[PDB]
Write an enzyme that holds these catalytic residues in place. Structure first.
Site, PDB file in Angstrom:
ATOM      1  N   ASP A  16      68.135  63.063   2.630  1.00  0.00           N
ATOM      2  CA  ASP A  16      68.172  61.698   2.103  1.00  0.00           C
ATOM      3  C   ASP A  16      68.364  61.669   0.596  1.00  0.00           C
ATOM      4  O   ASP A  16      67.851  62.530  -0.132  1.00  0.00           O
ATOM      5  CB  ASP A  16      66.903  60.939   2.474  1.00  0.00           C
ATOM      6  CG  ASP A  16      65.652  61.587   1.912  1.00  0.00           C
ATOM      7  OD1 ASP A  16      65.221  62.646   2.417  1.00  0.00           O
ATOM      8  OD2 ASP A  16      65.104  61.033   0.953  1.00  0.00           O
ATOM      9  N   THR A  76      63.467  70.212   5.186  1.00  0.00           N
ATOM     10  CA  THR A  76      64.311  69.134   4.706  1.00  0.00           C
ATOM     11  C   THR A  76      63.550  68.364   3.617  1.00  0.00           C
ATOM     12  O   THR A  76      62.314  68.413   3.561  1.00  0.00           O
ATOM     13  CB  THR A  76      64.768  68.202   5.852  1.00  0.00           C
ATOM     14  OG1 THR A  76      63.629  67.557   6.431  1.00  0.00           O
ATOM     15  CG2 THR A  76      65.532  69.001   6.945  1.00  0.00           C
ATOM     16  N   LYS A 114      63.021  66.381  -4.001  1.00  0.00           N
ATOM     17  CA  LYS A 114      61.687  65.801  -3.799  1.00  0.00           C
ATOM     18  C   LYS A 114      61.139  66.156  -2.404  1.00  0.00           C
ATOM     19  O   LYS A 114      61.803  65.926  -1.387  1.00  0.00           O
ATOM     20  CB  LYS A 114      61.760  64.280  -3.986  1.00  0.00           C
ATOM     21  CG  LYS A 114      60.434  63.501  -3.915  1.00  0.00           C
ATOM     22  CD  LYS A 114      60.756  61.997  -3.837  1.00  0.00           C
ATOM     23  CE  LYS A 114      59.493  61.143  -3.566  1.00  0.00           C
ATOM     24  NZ  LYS A 114      58.965  61.401  -2.187  1.00  0.00           N
ATOM     25  N   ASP A 115      59.932  66.717  -2.339  1.00  0.00           N
ATOM     26  CA  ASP A 115      59.331  67.014  -1.030  1.00  0.00           C
ATOM     27  C   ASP A 115      57.827  66.753  -0.983  1.00  0.00           C
ATOM     28  O   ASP A 115      57.270  66.146  -1.900  1.00  0.00           O
ATOM     29  CB  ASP A 115      59.642  68.454  -0.569  1.00  0.00           C
ATOM     30  CG  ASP A 115      58.753  69.491  -1.250  1.00  0.00           C
ATOM     31  OD1 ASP A 115      58.242  69.182  -2.347  1.00  0.00           O
ATOM     32  OD2 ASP A 115      58.574  70.597  -0.698  1.00  0.00           O
ATOM     33  N   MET A 116      57.177  67.249   0.077  1.00  0.00           N
ATOM     34  CA  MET A 116      55.739  67.046   0.235  1.00  0.00           C
ATOM     35  C   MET A 116      54.882  68.317   0.318  1.00  0.00           C
ATOM     36  O   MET A 116      53.680  68.232   0.523  1.00  0.00           O
ATOM     37  CB  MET A 116      55.472  66.088   1.410  1.00  0.00           C
ATOM     38  CG  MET A 116      56.053  64.683   1.147  1.00  0.00           C
ATOM     39  SD  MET A 116      56.045  63.584   2.617  1.00  0.00           S
ATOM     40  CE  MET A 116      54.287  63.442   2.954  1.00  0.00           C
ATOM     41  N   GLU A 117      55.481  69.500   0.167  1.00  0.00           N
ATOM     42  CA  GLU A 117      54.689  70.734   0.304  1.00  0.00           C
ATOM     43  C   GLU A 117      54.946  71.852  -0.716  1.00  0.00           C
ATOM     44  O   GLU A 117      54.037  72.633  -1.007  1.00  0.00           O
ATOM     45  CB  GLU A 117      54.861  71.334   1.705  1.00  0.00           C
ATOM     46  CG  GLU A 117      54.351  70.471   2.859  1.00  0.00           C
ATOM     47  CD  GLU A 117      55.409  69.486   3.380  1.00  0.00           C
ATOM     48  OE1 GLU A 117      56.628  69.748   3.164  1.00  0.00           O
ATOM     49  OE2 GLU A 117      55.008  68.485   4.027  1.00  0.00           O
ATOM     50  N   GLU A 173      61.840  71.298  12.616  1.00  0.00           N
ATOM     51  CA  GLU A 173      62.589  72.095  11.629  1.00  0.00           C
ATOM     52  C   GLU A 173      62.562  73.590  11.991  1.00  0.00           C
ATOM     53  O   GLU A 173      63.512  74.319  11.720  1.00  0.00           O
ATOM     54  CB  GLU A 173      62.035  71.914  10.190  1.00  0.00           C
ATOM     55  CG  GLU A 173      61.814  70.471   9.688  1.00  0.00           C
ATOM     56  CD  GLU A 173      61.188  70.366   8.271  1.00  0.00           C
ATOM     57  OE1 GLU A 173      60.076  70.906   7.994  1.00  0.00           O
ATOM     58  OE2 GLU A 173      61.816  69.696   7.425  1.00  0.00           O
TER      59      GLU A 173
HETATM   60  N1  LIG Z   1      62.661  61.670   0.419  1.00  0.00           N
HETATM   61  C1  LIG Z   1      61.675  62.531   0.677  1.00  0.00           C
HETATM   62  N2  LIG Z   1      60.635  62.570  -0.184  1.00  0.00           N
HETATM   63  C2  LIG Z   1      59.633  63.427   0.055  1.00  0.00           C
HETATM   64  N3  LIG Z   1      59.501  64.280   1.071  1.00  0.00           N
HETATM   65  C3  LIG Z   1      60.550  64.220   1.911  1.00  0.00           C
HETATM   66  N4  LIG Z   1      60.739  64.956   3.058  1.00  0.00           N
HETATM   67  C4  LIG Z   1      61.944  64.543   3.573  1.00  0.00           C
HETATM   68  N5  LIG Z   1      62.535  63.609   2.854  1.00  0.00           N
HETATM   69  C5  LIG Z   1      61.655  63.394   1.798  1.00  0.00           C
END
Ligand SMILES: Nc1ncnc2[nH]cnc12
Ligand SMILES: Nc1ncnc2c([C@@H]3O[C@H](CO)[C@@H](O)[C@H]3O)n[nH]c12
EC number: 3.2.2.16
Lengths: 245, 248
Positions: free
Chosen positions: B206, B97, B180-183, B19
């Site tokens: 997505d 992303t 929605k993400d992870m950080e 990224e």
């Molecule tokens: N669908 C998703 N959910 C969480 N983190 C993401 N990072 C990229 N796509 C993701």
């Protein structure tokens, strides 16, 4: 050959730290050495061949409660290692236990190894990463001399337990459940510092009482049990090298 | 005693190195070699200058054990903390992303300017801990940037799982998140502690509530949406240059 000369405790709740602070006559740090304006709390002292520091994430600015969970525990672990350069980290706190695994309320456990139950990444090799299996530092003489129970700890940021949390906790055959341990281990690993865990059972996850109610019910009495063990752990470490334990 | 003046530096926190590279390439940023965030760490820092702005891009880099990007809230929080203390940014931009909800108006390729952020996986059913676990934090207000770039806006919800359980979905629906993400929420937490302005650019790769992609679709979205993120980040960098925080 080099005897241990500096121990840092990482403790998520100030109320859990105080019994230890008092026992060793530690004093509250006043100069914010880890950074200006942070809510973190540090207590320092010497006893007697050991430097002792106890660090806490402190309280939420807005809400007033202890900043529990993996993110703050990781930050204070990182920051205290970089500032104080300890020989060993000890994450001391309360946890849930599984009766089926031999856990009883009030038990203070040593930890064999640690995993996460809430980092699910369903791609091979990322999956292993999420689970984050890490071994605590081997302390067989401490284990034997103090006669402590031992088991695997599973960590996540929720005090309750989802279906998917349970699935992972069971699959990893954990005895214990907490909210910081695996993240402390990740940071200790990254900075190459031996880590040990003392986890004192406040609630039975496979039991018949609600988690939050039972946790709150037993917090005070179990924290005193945690102090008693942590005190014996410091006394044992004194004068020893890492090989001795 | 303090007179306000243009921003001098920005740090980008980007979870995955792939990224970051297009932004690094676009601005010809150099990968640092003098361990600016600490010796013996896998973290990566890129540094350069664009006109009147110093640009630092920080990535958690490769996991020692497995070699993958060190994704999730714990590494993101660590690099954010360390880079603020070492690099003294005027502003932090979490760019990456993420997933999106078509029911909330998201589409593949959209780059959102996040309004605010929460966690969906810190469930603490006790008064005042509950709110703490949710961790609601507002992004720094950037109205002129939004007037110029016209990015979609929405709430971001963070957790350490890439999939979505029903329990996760329940909080995400309750909190009315679009993304929605992870950080992100963990980056915001650290930014808040150290009182640094924080912005988020989140590019939807997505649709969490949409049809599964095909193989050619999956890969295409990965190229095209990462390129979209770079294009938007480049425009933000050109926009921020020479501006006070109050002008954006
Ligand atoms: N669908 C998703 N959910 C969480 N983190 C993401 N990072 C990229 N796509 C993701
Ligand atoms: N059943 C349980 N699940 C998760 N954490 C805990 C705890 C610990 O107590 C605190 C609860 O927020 C936190 O520090 C956590 O590690 N006690 N019982 C627990």
């Amino acid at each position: 050959l080099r005897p241990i000369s500096s121990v840092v405790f990482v403790i998520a709740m100030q109320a859990e730290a105080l019994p230890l602070v008092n026992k060793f006559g530690l004093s509250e740090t006043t100069d914010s050495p880890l950074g200006k304006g942070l809510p973190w709390v540090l207590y320092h002292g010497v006893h007697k061949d050991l430097r002792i520091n106890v660090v806490c994430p402190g309280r939420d600015a807005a809400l007033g409660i202890d900043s529990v969970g993996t993110v703050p525990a990781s930050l204070i672990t990182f920051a205290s290692i970089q500032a104080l350069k300890p020989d060993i980290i000890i994450n001391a706190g309360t946890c849930g236990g599984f009766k089926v695994k031999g856990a009883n309320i009030g038990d203070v456990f040593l930890v064999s190894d640690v995993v996460f139950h809430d980092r699910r990444i369903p791609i091979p090799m990322f999956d292993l990463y999420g689970v984050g299996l890490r071994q605590a530092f081997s302390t067989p003489n401490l284990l034997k001399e103090l006669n402590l129970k031992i088991g695997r700890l599973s960590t996540g940021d929720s005090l309750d337990m989802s279906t998917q949390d349970e699935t992972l906790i069971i699959a990893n055959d954990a005895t214990l459940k907490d909210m910081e341990g695996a993240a402390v281990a990740y940071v200790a690993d990254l900075l190459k510092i031996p880590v040990v865990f003392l986890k004192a059972v406040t609630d039975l996850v496979d039991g018949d009482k609600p988690t939050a109610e039972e946790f709150l019910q037993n917090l005070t009495v179990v924290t005193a049990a945690l102090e008693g063990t942590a005190t014996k752990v410091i006394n044992f470490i004194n004068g020893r090298n890492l090989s001795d334990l």
